[PDB]
Design a protein around this ligand. Structure first.
Ligand code: FAD
Ligand code: FAD
Ligand code: FAD
Ligand code: FAD
Ligand code: AAC
Ligand code: AAC
Ligand code: AAC
Ligand code: AAC
Lengths: 364, 364, 364, 364
């Protein structure tokens, strides 16, 4: 482990892992410190949906950043593979955001003004996905909201960053950041390092660093538990989605099913009531899933923030320090764009003022 | 593997495993053939309740055999331990068979005429188990219906039988039984053996042998799925039981929760709807369980028979062949008594004519 | 479960699965009976190498078959994906059959005259695979001996078959095959069925059927123990092969390592001595593997025949009954060719008489 | 989570757990903050030997402490069961410290003058343990160096503590300990708390607190890798010990084997080289283990200090702050004595000055 780097990334999740990749692409000698194993926390609990549309509320800049990030996923799997040997496992089936009420229809039809987003009548859906619940008023088919396996998207980025110089240190918790002197100074139980730039990408745990650097930005964990089953009997190509819950078909024959939302809960293991809730919900969307064999059950801590938006930007009082945390429900989707934006702020290139202002560290 | 044995046991579950023990106790040179690993099937899916009372319907001989078998469990754990080093993990907390309706009360109060079976008012129960549902009309406390870990009761018997001569062969499926010649003849992919006595203890799979020996006795699988959670917050000493479902506290801090009843289903892995059903049921009995961390989920095939009673006895046309299969819901409880009875029929001792007639192979 | 099928396949490993698929494709009312779960035995333990050049020490019928089957894999992945939604995870890195002595070189050079196969020097190997043992005398590069994940290619076959109308019955052991009427009669615990064609594809457990049908063909299990690790640090694109042992890099970042050769052992879980043995071997081939984190360990029973060759074809005295078992170390590779052969025979089409004679059921 | 507690224990491994229990027993409004789950780190990796005679190469204060702690285990199981419902799984077989050379004998004989410790000859050992290596020169029998299952004794302490009023907070990392008011101030992501006594028991991660409080005591992880097997065939009642390596027979039928010694490695999962190493060692001590089925593999970080001795006591410049970390290879054994010591110090009772000086925080 060297003693000085031009840039150091604190966090081995998909965010920090992506940032490390883009920096090493800029040939910027950089290192990354992960308290545990790469993509070992929230990142490996994610479904992997590139849900720019499905998670759309309004038409602000957040949505544009997301759409931008979604474009970035084009070919990215090939890029990282040729450098890692790790397949991100992309599935282009698309998504069916289901409607079970008139209110659901009103909400889904607000995307009529967008491409690759078309409305399907109940019969049109059941013709493509015969086993989707028959209680549907129809669904919105989002062709681009496809999916990938987050754990491998992360491992791909990391393995690729290494083959580009990046030095990755696991089981190396960063304990403190000293912005004193003329260069930044980080301390770990394995040693202390110097850098010209420090990027906080510790997910929901990032608060500690903000505080350390005088900032007050807080994070709230939003626990989500899921399960998977083996779908050996019915066909299911498109991802079924409804009210923040989903059933995504993996290329392995497994269906990733989930999401409870438990604010303030820091535990990372599923509770009985949580899984029961997911099982109950999934049956209303895919009745046949009740006969499928259960596989695994897990949980993750979504990095929540006061306004639901992430913090992606320079420290107000010190541009040498940056932050990329609080991607709540879209960390996987927004990785490519978050990485590029941080790498572009370090390389001091020109960046979209709207996005940069949208995610600024000092918000009302 | 020898070529001749005075007695051969076909089945390594808890039944065959117990029979092998008692025979080797009689110093009868015997061997056992298990298609897979010992106690690897239904036996290791069982909760381990010695439910002679809880599974009581009427007051026939079946119930007496059960009560007898329950007595046999006295000290048995010590006996087998001193010979195996394997602890059966016995828990003497007792059982609370809960009542949620007047009909439940009427049914439970029919045991008033028995010792170690007392009625508890709602308040008396909540005083002993504060977290049991408050919707109860009270419960029947069955002091003797305690529990053990079946897998280890089985391993204990087997390990003990070995230290007594018994020769145990795993991964040795018995393919056929020839009662021709003057001695029995069994065939396995690993060889053929001769014996003076053959005992069929293949659980729900025993049908094949009955047929082979001209008998028509059929078996129906009754699949049951369960799960376990970690109870790190509340006290729970007594086993909560209701309508064939239960919550049994293990000495490890885990709660074994279960039982769906799926007739005709031969699959041994839980389906999503099954577990959801168990989770839902358990919450009505122990509301707090919903906050507990899930551990594992599994399933087993209860050996079902036409009249709900097992077949424990000699082949009508050949006393050299015996059967001990179809213990449906009480295989763990009835092992000690089933073993002793079979070993007593081989050693040609005198046995209870009622039990012997109750479980005869040729029934109406 | 119907009462009559044109064809009944007994066994659901990759072989029976492939067979069921091709029959479904030929539009034949077909059913497959699997004792447990599809691909749950030997198939799930295999590395998945299409090692057609491990059977070229003599360019006979066997080698032509292996080569032909290897050819059939071109495009098979896409074909099955379209119908299954399951990715077989094919990796085209190729293979480096390492040499650690002159004799090794002499032996390995003998296949230089083969197409897509060429020799590399100790320094030309290290140029591609820098971390390969520095004690090698070079290696033969086999471009076409790529690899897939056996379990998924099996599940893809089965799923594709289901979509084409094949009826798959898991947890349905076939107990006995009867021939008396103008058709066959199969017996399972879940009822009986009639067919015009029965195909025995029970892997190493096929013996009982051969014996049931008058043949004495024997099967001997040859246990193989393996392990896997995570290769997060060094590059490895080619599979390293030596003395039947190997290191195959999967697209997940895992290295599948192995195989012990234990004749007559029917246990399916690895023992300590065997794993130590595999670890030791792997280290001689890829020194760095010593610092890699262990993932999993497992074992499987290669189905061995007296001559180590499969029995693929009709029953000598009944062309309604076919066999397809005993693929020692090449079950995965030969899956396509074996399935096409059995399917074509049942369709009574024209077939290479050399192969048909090479796999005769009654070999001297 | 309240705002003020008399005592706050930081760390939930067996040490902090024990401490929390004794304080609860002394009726002290106490809270314990565990970063993840109770006993989820090093504690869960330990074998659980009460090896008090591994620290007698010099009968000093350390040995007296070890002996005293070993004494405290008498009855501890029952005491914690009564309150927890958790069995600690104590096994009293004793230990055979094997000798493979004359020097081994010379060294091991030196403790013959100790009570309950006696020497056995190569033939007297094989009389008790027939399968012990035939290459031994005999062994020392330590009757009191029995074993328990670390995880459960930890969970028993915690549960017993909860019943006595201790408030345990999992998934609650303590970020910083502040001293300024008349009391201490602990900071967690889930809020802040005040206390009159803080006890640092974070195992190998304790360094950051020492440093936060002005001390420079360092911790170095010494990774230990292990594995387990099923011993279904041979008898083994005594634990086999040699050169810090061991084979402990558990009451489940498992053999816990191990320990590699890897200084400075913070990874918590075993690597291939380390496991091969452990397997090789075990085979020299118990040849038959070679044919046993592998169960699991795991690792843990022994918390190492400059002198391999724990830091147990008050902060040199603030008696409100205590430490209890760095129990290299004896954390389990010393759990009772360490907990009683810290509890008594907080209760400001009389304490053995020799031990208090042996574990001083500022050792030259
Ligand atoms: C059930 C569930 C389903 C989801 N599905 C989707 C989905 O379909 N699509 C999508 O886009 N998003 C999804 N998400 C959200 C997504 O998982 C997250 O937003 C994303 O993983 C966050 O990534 P991260 O890199 O910011 O943080 P994390 O992945 O949580 O990692 C932070 C990392 O920093 C490390 N760290 C913490 N403190 C320190 C320290 N002091 N020093 C060094 N390292 C430290 C951690 O150990 C960890 O490796 C889902 C979330 C959940 C819970
Ligand atoms: C969810 C669940 C909970 C339960 N809880 C309880 C409880 O609390 N108390 C209680 O008393 N009972 C309980 N039971 C029931 C109990 O598990 C069974 O009655 C008992 O395990 C049956 O034991 P067995 O030995 O007859 O059969 P099994 O344990 O099913 O074993 C039969 C054995 O024979 C082998 N075999 C089969 N065919 C062959 C062959 N051809 N050659 C060689 N070997 C062969 C099998 O592989 C297997 O090892 C429960 C069951 C379930 C499903
Ligand atoms: C460690 C190891 C590594 C290997 N690596 C390779 C490799 O790289 N490449 C390669 O080509 N090969 C490899 N092989 C070999 C390959 O795994 C086998 O040849 C192949 O799996 C055999 O497939 P199968 O379908 O014939 O049998 P199996 O996969 O063993 O399945 C037979 C099936 O029939 C079922 N069955 C049995 N009896 C009955 C009954 N009465 N009724 C119904 N079903 C029944 C079984 O339960 C099972 O599903 C390897 C093997 C091992 C052990
Ligand atoms: C392979 C192996 C075998 C062993 N065998 C034995 C044996 O036979 N006998 C024996 O006596 N010893 C044995 N030991 C040693 C023994 O395991 C340890 O000494 C003991 O586990 C240490 O316990 P601890 O509670 O001090 O630390 P740990 O058990 O490591 O736990 C420290 C705890 O503090 C938590 N923590 C860390 N930072 C924070 C924070 N900021 N806030 C809150 N919580 C935090 C951790 O997450 C963890 O729960 C063995 C060790 C190994 C590795
Ligand atoms: C993008 C998305 O839908 N994520 C799911 C979740 O966070 O639960
Ligand atoms: C004896 C008993 O209650 N068993 C439970 C079950 O079989 O589901
Ligand atoms: C030649 C080959 O693929 N061998 C694999 C195995 O059976 O271990
Ligand atoms: C002496 C002793 O118990 N050692 C265990 C270990 O730390 O590996």
């Amino acid at each position: 482990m060297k003693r000085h780097y031009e840039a150091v990334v604190i966090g081995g999740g998909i965010i920090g892992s992506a940032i490390a990749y883009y920096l090493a692409k800029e040939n910027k000698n950089t290192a990354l410190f992960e308290s545990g194993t790469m993509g070992g926390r929230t990142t490996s609990a994610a479904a992997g949906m590139l849900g720019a549309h499905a998670e759309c509320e309004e038409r602000d800049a957040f949505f544009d950043f997301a759409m931008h990030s979604q474009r970035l996923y084009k070919g990215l799997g090939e890029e990282l593979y040729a450098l890692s040997g790790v397949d991100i496992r992309q599935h282009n089936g698309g998504m069916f955001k289901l409607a079970f009420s008139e209110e659901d229809v009103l909400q889904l039809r607000q995307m009529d003004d967008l491409d690759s987003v078309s409305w399907y009548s109940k019969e049109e859906v059941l013709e493509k996905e015969p086993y989707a619940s028959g209680d549907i008023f129809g669904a919105s088919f989002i062709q681009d909201d496809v999916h990938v396996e987050p754990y491998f998207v992360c491992k791909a980025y990391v393995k690729a960053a290494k083959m580009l110089g990046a030095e990755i240190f696991e089981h190396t918790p960063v304990l403190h950041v000293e912005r004193d002197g003329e260069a930044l100074f980080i301390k770990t139980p394995s040693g202390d390092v110097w850098a010209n730039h420090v990027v906080v990408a510790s997910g929901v745990w990032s608060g500690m660093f903000f505080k350390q650097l005088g900032l007050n930005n807080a994070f709230l964990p939003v626990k989500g538990e899921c399960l998977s089953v083996w779908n050996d009997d019915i066909p299911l190509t498109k991802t079924l989605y409804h009210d923040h819950c989903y059933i995504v078909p993996r290329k392995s024959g497994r269906l990733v099913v989930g999401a409870t939302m438990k604010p303030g809960d820091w535990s990372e293991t599923p509770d009985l009531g949580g899984l029961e809730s997911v099982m109950k919900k999934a049956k209303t969307m895919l009745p046949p899933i009740q006969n499928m064999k259960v596989d695994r059950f897990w949980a993750g801590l979504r990095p929540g923030t006061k306004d639901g938006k992430p913090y992606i930007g320079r420290h107000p009082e010190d541009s040498r320090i940056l932050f990329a945390a609080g991607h709540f429900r879209n960390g996987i989707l927004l990785a490519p764009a978050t990485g590029a934006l941080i790498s572009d702020l370090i390389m001091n290139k020109e960046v979209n003022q709207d996005w940069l202002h949208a995610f600024r560290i000092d918000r009302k």
